Amino acid sequence: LLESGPGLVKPSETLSLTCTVSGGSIWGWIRQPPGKGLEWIGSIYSSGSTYYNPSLKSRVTTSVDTSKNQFSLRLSSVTAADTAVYYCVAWFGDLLSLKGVELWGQGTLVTVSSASTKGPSVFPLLGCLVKDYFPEPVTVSWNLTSGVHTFPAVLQSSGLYSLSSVVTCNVDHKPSNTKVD
Amino acid sequence: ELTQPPSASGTPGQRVTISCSGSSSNIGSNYVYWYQQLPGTAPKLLIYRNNQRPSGVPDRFSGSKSGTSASLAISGLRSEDEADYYCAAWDDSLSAWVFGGGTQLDILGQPKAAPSVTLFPPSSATLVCLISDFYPGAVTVAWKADSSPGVETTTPSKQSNNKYAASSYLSLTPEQWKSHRSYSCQVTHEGSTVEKTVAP
Numbered sequence: 102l103l104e105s106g107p108g109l110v111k112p113s114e115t116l117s118l119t120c121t122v123s124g125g126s127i128w129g130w131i132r133q134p135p136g137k138g139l140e141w142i143g144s145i146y147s148s149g150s151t152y153y154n155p156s157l158k159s160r161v162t163t164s165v166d167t168s169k170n171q172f173s174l175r176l177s178s179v180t181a182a183d184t185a186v187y188y189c190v191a192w193f194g195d196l197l198s199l200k201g202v203e204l205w206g207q208g209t210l211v212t213v214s215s216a217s218t219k220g221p222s223v224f225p226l227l228g229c230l231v232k233d234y235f236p237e238p239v240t241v242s243w244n245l246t247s248g249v250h251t252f253p254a255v256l257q258s259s260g261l262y263s264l265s266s267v268v269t270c271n272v273d274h275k276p277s278n279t280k281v282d
Numbered sequence: 283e284l285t286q287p288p289s290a291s292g293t294p295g296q297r298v299t300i301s302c303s304g305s306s307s308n309i310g311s312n313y314v315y316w317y318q319q320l321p322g323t324a325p326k327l328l329i330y331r332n333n334q335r336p337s338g339v340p341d342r343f344s345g346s347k348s349g350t351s352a353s354l355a356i357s358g359l360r361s362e363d364e365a366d367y368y369c370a371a372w373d374d375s376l377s378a379w380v381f382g383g384g385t386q387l388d389i390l391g392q393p394k395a396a397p398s399v400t401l402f403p404p405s406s407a408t409l410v411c412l413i414s415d416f417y418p419g420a421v422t423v424a425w426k427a428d429s430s431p432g433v434e435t436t437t438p439s440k441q442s443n444n445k446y447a448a449s450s451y452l453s454l455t456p457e458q459w460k461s462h463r464s465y466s467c468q469v470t471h472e473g474s475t476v477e478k479t480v481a482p
Contacts, residue, residue: 129379131325139317139325139368141379152377188324201336205324226402230410250414252449255436265410265449267400 104189104206108276109236110213116176120189120206127192128165128172132185133208140185142174179213186210212236216260220279221272229270232263240273241266283308284369286382292359293390300385302352302369308380309371314352316345317368319384321440325368329354356387364389364444392417394472395445401467401478407459409452411467411478418472419446426466426477 106118122128129144143153143163153161162175172191176183186208193202214236221234231239241251245268254262272281285303292298302314316329327336329345332352344355352369369382397416403409413421419438424431435450450467459465464481 131381138384139319139370139381141370141381144379152379154378155376199337201327201330201334201339203327203330203336205326208324224408225405226410228402228410228412230402230405230408232408250412250441250447252412252414252447253436253439255434255449255451257434257451257453263408263451265402265412267412267414 102189102191102204102206104187104209106209106211108210108212108238109218110179110183110211111215112180112213113178116179116183116187116211116213117173118187118189118209118211119171119173120191121170122167122172122189122191122204123170124167125191125193125204128163129190129192130163130174131188131190132183133188134185137185142176142187145172181213184211184213210237218277219261220274220277221263221281223270223272223281226265226267228265228267229272230263230265231272233257233259233261234263234274234277235261236276237262239264242271242273244269244271283373283376283380284371284382286367286369286385288383289386289388290367291388291390292356292363294359294361296359297355297357298359298387300354300356300367300369300387302354302382304350304352304371304380306350307375308350308373309347309352310350311374312372314345314347315370316343316352316354317370318343319366319368321365328367359389361389361392361444363387364440389444392444394418396474397421397469397471397476399467399469399476399478401480403465403480403482404454404456404459407454407456409454409459409465409467409480411450411452411469413448413450413469415441415443415445415447416471417445420471421446421448422470423448423450424468424470425450425452426464426468428462428464 126147130142165172189206224230251266254264317325319325332347395417432453
């Protein structure tokens with residue numbers, strides 16, 4: 102499924118995300134804080150029946166509109182505690198000849214922070230140095246796929262990330278809407 | 283609510299079993315579901331209804347449920363199976379979907395591998411030391427200015443080929459970089475140190 106919405110949300114504000122889906126009978130949201138396990142947020146059934154994680158239930162809004170191929174999540178009054186990769190999930194089950202179909206979004210990292218979004222500066226290494234950006238993530242393509250190694254970001258003392266990619270590099274930093282060749 | 287052992291391991295070609303422990307309100311009365319999650323990837327459904335495979339899941343994966351416990355079995359193990367595995371089930375008493383804490387599966391029998399080390403100078407100041415393809419996943423990193431020992435070094439992490447990577451960074455001012463004959467990234471792995479050097 103295709104997932105979208107800001108990767109940066111301020112403390113006390115509202116996280117909003119959408120997934121496009123065509124059909125299904127159960128729709129839900131699952132999250133995973135960095136280095137942690139999966140945590141169910143909520144589900145909506147085709148009947149409209151709706152269930153939320155009790156530790157979150159005051160802050161969660163989920164909605165489905167199947168005619169507009171969408172389902173959505175809002176999470177109000179966020180804190181650093183809500184920093185996580187968020188996944189939307191759609192159950193189809195036994196459809197045609199296919200069995201147990203459950204589609205997952207690719208996962209969207211949402212960082213709860215009052216710090217500003219900051220685009221990267223790109224420097225030549227061969228490779229490309231992607232430095233001093235915030236928040237994660239940065240993605241890198243070349244033009245070339247073989248022999249490409251993009252490393253995990255360092256978090257520097259500045260509170261900003263930097264990473265390196267080794268083999269024209271195409272750096273994408275969606276949170277700041279920055280694409281560097 | 284659902285307990286899994288934090289880690290499991292197996293040997294290529296062989297088998298592993300991963301357990302999931304719950305209660306009568308979840309596993310005892312409800313279907314169990316299993317997920318595979320490769321690092322930085324979406325979880326993938328392996329098993330539904332306790333013991334059924336979705337289309338496109340290898341029959342190397344199988345599930346069973348024994349009272350208030352469930353188990354995922356993986357046969358014909360491969361290095362690519364190295365991942366986190368999660369059980370899940372509905373809980374009648376919380377009216378909630380609950381997940382196990384997850385089990386990290388390590389695949390054994392990897393030979394030891396010296397790190398590939400690449401030191402970049404600052405382009406025409408930050409020094410970038412890239413350490414790749416090492417096993418096991420521990421590295422000691424040390425920097426030299428000329429001969430004498432702003433360092434930020436990433437925790438090691440698993441690559442896709444199940445070997446390990448790390449990067450070390452050295453921030454300098456342009457004047458600091460110019461006033462030395464060389465700078466060095468020294469990488470120690472299993473008591474074996476390789477030095478890389480760059481020169482202003």
